[PDB]
Write an enzyme that holds these catalytic residues in place. Structure first.
Site, short mmCIF file in Angstrom:
data_model
loop_
_atom_site.label_atom_id
_atom_site.label_comp_id
_atom_site.label_asym_id
_atom_site.label_seq_id
_atom_site.Cartn_x
_atom_site.Cartn_y
_atom_site.Cartn_z
N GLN A 11 0.82 -1.20 0.00
CA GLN A 11 0.00 0.00 0.00
C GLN A 11 0.86 1.26 0.00
O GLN A 11 0.61 2.18 -0.78
CB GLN A 11 -0.95 -0.01 1.20
CG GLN A 11 -2.06 1.01 1.11
CD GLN A 11 -2.68 1.33 2.45
OE1 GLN A 11 -2.65 2.47 2.91
NE2 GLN A 11 -3.25 0.31 3.09
N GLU A 62 -3.90 -6.99 -1.70
CA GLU A 62 -5.19 -6.46 -1.27
C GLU A 62 -5.72 -5.52 -2.34
O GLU A 62 -5.04 -4.55 -2.70
CB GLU A 62 -5.03 -5.75 0.08
CG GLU A 62 -6.32 -5.35 0.77
CD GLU A 62 -6.90 -4.04 0.29
OE1 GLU A 62 -6.12 -3.17 -0.15
OE2 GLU A 62 -8.13 -3.89 0.38
N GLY A 135 3.16 -6.83 6.01
CA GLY A 135 3.33 -8.20 5.57
C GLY A 135 3.65 -8.33 4.09
O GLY A 135 4.74 -8.75 3.72
N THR A 170 2.34 2.55 13.80
CA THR A 170 0.95 2.27 13.47
C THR A 170 0.54 0.85 13.82
O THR A 170 -0.59 0.63 14.25
CB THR A 170 0.71 2.55 11.98
OG1 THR A 170 1.09 3.90 11.68
CG2 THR A 170 -0.76 2.36 11.63
N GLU A 245 27.43 4.71 -11.28
CA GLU A 245 28.51 5.41 -10.60
C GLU A 245 28.15 5.75 -9.16
O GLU A 245 28.35 6.88 -8.71
CB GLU A 245 28.87 6.68 -11.37
CG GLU A 245 29.44 6.44 -12.76
CD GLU A 245 29.71 7.73 -13.51
OE1 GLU A 245 30.04 7.67 -14.71
OE2 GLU A 245 29.61 8.81 -12.89
N1 LIG Z 1 5.56 7.23 4.03
C1 LIG Z 1 4.45 6.50 3.97
N2 LIG Z 1 4.33 5.35 4.73
C2 LIG Z 1 3.20 4.61 4.68
C3 LIG Z 1 2.16 4.99 3.86
N3 LIG Z 1 1.17 4.09 3.99
C4 LIG Z 1 1.57 3.14 4.87
N4 LIG Z 1 2.83 3.45 5.31
C5 LIG Z 1 3.64 2.68 6.26
O1 LIG Z 1 3.49 1.30 6.01
C6 LIG Z 1 3.48 0.56 7.22
C7 LIG Z 1 2.60 -0.68 7.09
O2 LIG Z 1 2.69 -1.22 5.79
P1 LIG Z 1 1.60 -0.82 4.68
O3 LIG Z 1 2.28 -0.26 3.45
O4 LIG Z 1 0.64 0.19 5.25
O5 LIG Z 1 0.81 -2.17 4.34
P2 LIG Z 1 1.47 -3.27 3.37
O6 LIG Z 1 2.92 -2.94 3.11
O7 LIG Z 1 0.69 -3.32 2.09
O8 LIG Z 1 1.35 -4.66 4.16
P3 LIG Z 1 -0.09 -5.29 4.50
O9 LIG Z 1 -0.53 -4.77 5.85
O10 LIG Z 1 0.02 -6.79 4.56
O11 LIG Z 1 -1.11 -4.89 3.46
C8 LIG Z 1 2.96 1.52 8.27
O12 LIG Z 1 3.69 1.38 9.46
C9 LIG Z 1 3.15 2.90 7.69
O13 LIG Z 1 4.13 3.60 8.43
C10 LIG Z 1 2.27 6.15 3.09
O14 LIG Z 1 1.34 6.50 2.37
N5 LIG Z 1 3.42 6.90 3.15
MG LIG Z 2 -2.28 -3.49 2.73
#
Ligand SMILES: Nc1nc2c(ncn2[C@@H]2O[C@H](COP(=O)(O)OP(=O)(O)OP(=O)(O)O)[C@@H](O)[C@H]2O)c(=O)[nH]1
Ligand SMILES: [Mg+2]
EC number: 3.6.5.-
Lengths: 430, 49
Positions: A11, A62, A135, A170, A245
């Site tokens: 995400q 997802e 995950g 989070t 480089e």
């Molecule tokens: N900088 C930034 N970090 C994000 C953003 N969205 C989620 N995160 C970070 O991603 C972490 C969790 O992973 P996510 O990307 O939200 O979810 P995922 O990587 O798809 O993993 P799943 O939960 O299995 O779907 C959180 O602790 C957030 O700090 C975003 O839009 N910008």
């Molecule tokens: Mg997700």
């Protein structure tokens, strides 16, 4: 005849990919429909007549974010069948996205990667984006990196990972999969850049003067950093720098490739024009510890090598006159075995502004990529967080029941201990 | 420690006086001395990982 492929998984990865892909389309004059109303070739490909197709692939298990992408204004831009989507989410479980559901999806992604690579003739390397504390993101990023490292071999891969903040979090289980993913990409990625959210929140609050930021404001700054890094491949410049480089200039040893970034200037249009934004003041602001893009203190450690990019109307002599001033200061000290540590790049194209965004239009900007010994603190604090819950084996049953072995947690701990010992061993003077 | 250069007769007189004060006044005229004993305790080797 120079190309690069960007991989977006998870995400956070998809939400920062959207942020960078408005910016690239705006910078090359391409409308959201993909139609123009020879520099595009680095990120895009010509279809023969009309539209351009990005050299990017979006991955997620997802479906919500991909469905949001496929209905927005950019529905016509991306190829319909490179937005690979799953059905069941990994739900913050690393073992799920590495052993259970990611394996059935990884083959389609690898087929898409091959189909995109056969089109390129001068492939410079890969870019990958993934939020580490999830995950599917961490697991699929690990699996894709492991497959690519053997399918292609010596091609360079760059990772813009977002580690969790020191105290702000989070999830509750993100140290486990963060440590496992660091284990996985330690021996598999050529460059890793630190991107934790707390530092960028502080940057927005102090400079942009926004008291209620959202994720889009963070992603726009990250997109600007990416554009500054890759500008030298698609615009004429007095002192060019290529992706290949880097390991010859920023990576003293194969194990040490985690570095933290900074950007300057960051200022709003309401008070930007009242000051001259000289090169000296922007290069001073870039080295300020409070303007680090990752929440780490550079005053707590030595520098190893600094690679820093300029763009705009900057003149090399003014750059040298400012590097001398920084070498003069007593609060910034370099490692003993590195007499000169600066690599300088100069480009002519000024940074582009996104309408309705935060940043204003300026003629000079600086982006630094600096490798420093102080980065070991984030590893130490993540290790301390991991040990607290691993002492009582909490939340382990959610991982053992997804096919992962019991001993897999220990060896990641040993590799982190080895990395921390290596960082201490390198930083001592001879 | 036997460091007090005292005749045994005065040592016994002082002890009898102390016992009398301890019974009657619940107070000792002898100053308490610290005795340090090294004790060996078991601690778990919690791996500082
Ligand atoms: N900088 C930034 N970090 C994000 C953003 N969205 C989620 N995160 C970070 O991603 C972490 C969790 O992973 P996510 O990307 O939200 O979810 P995922 O990587 O798809 O993993 P799943 O939960 O299995 O779907 C959180 O602790 C957030 O700090 C975003 O839009 N910008
Ligand atoms: Mg997700």
């Amino acid at each position: 005849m120079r190309e690069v492929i960007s991989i977006h998984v998870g995400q956070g990865g998809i939400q920062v990919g959207n942020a960078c892909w408005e910016l690239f389309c705006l910078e090359h004059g391409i409308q959201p429909d993909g139609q123009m109303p020879d520099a595009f070739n680095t990120f895009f490909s010509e279809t023969g007549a009309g539209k351009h197709v990005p050299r990017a692939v979006f991955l997620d298990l997802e479906p919500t974010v991909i469905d949001e992408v496929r209905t927005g204004t950019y529905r016509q831009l991306f190829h319909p069948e490179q937005l690979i989507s799953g059905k069941e989410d990994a739900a913050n479980n690393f073992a799920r996205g590495h052993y259970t559901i990611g394996k059935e999806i990884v083959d389609l992604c690898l087929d898409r990667i091959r189909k995109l690579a056969d089109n390129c003739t001068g492939l410079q390397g890969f870019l990958v984006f993934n939020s580490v504390g999830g995950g599917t993101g961490s697991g699929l990023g690990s699996l894709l990196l492991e497959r690519l490292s053997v399918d292609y071999g010596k091609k360079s891969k760059l990772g813009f990972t977002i580690y969790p903040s020191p105290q702000v979090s989070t999830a509750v289980v993100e140290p486990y999969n963060s440590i496992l993913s660091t284990h996985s990409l330690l021996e598999h990625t050529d460059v890793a850049v630190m991107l934790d959210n707390e530092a960028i929140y502080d940057i927005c609050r102090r400079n942009l003067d926004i008291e209620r930021p959202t994720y889009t404001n963070l992603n726009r700054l990250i997109a600007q950093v990416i554009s500054s890094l890759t500008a030298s491949l698609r615009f004429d410049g007095a002192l060019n720098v290529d992706i290949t480089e880097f390991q010859t200039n920023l990576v003293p040893y194969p194990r040490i490739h985690f570095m933290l970034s900074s950007y300057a200037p960051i200022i709003s249009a309401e008070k930007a024009y009242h000051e001259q934004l000289s090169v000296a003041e922007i290069t001073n602001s870039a080295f300020e510890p409070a303007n680090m893009m990752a929440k780490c203190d550079p005053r707590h450690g030595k520098y190893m090598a600094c690679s820093m990019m300029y763009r705009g109307d900057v003149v090399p002599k003014d750059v040298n006159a400012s590097i001398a001033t920084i070498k003069t200061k007593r609060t910034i000290q370099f490692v003993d075995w590195c007499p000169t540590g600066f690599k300088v790049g100069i480009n002519y194209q000024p940074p582009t502004v996104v309408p309705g965004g935060d940043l204003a239009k300026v003629m000079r900007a600086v982006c630094m990529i600096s490798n420093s010994t102080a980065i070991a603190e984030v590893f130490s604090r993540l290790d301390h967080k991991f040990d607290l819950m691993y002492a009582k084996r909490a939340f382990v049953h959610w991982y053992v029941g997804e096919g992962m072995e019991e001993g897999e947690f220990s060896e990641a701990r040993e590799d982190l201990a080895a990395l921390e010992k290596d960082y201490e061993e390198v930083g001592i003077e001879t | 420690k036997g460091i007090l250069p005292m005749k045994e007769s005065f040592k016994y007189a002082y002890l009898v006086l102390n016992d009398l004060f301890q019974e009657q006044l619940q107070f000792s005229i002898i100053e308490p001395k610290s005795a340090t004993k090294e004790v060996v305790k078991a601690q778990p080797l919690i791996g500082i990982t």
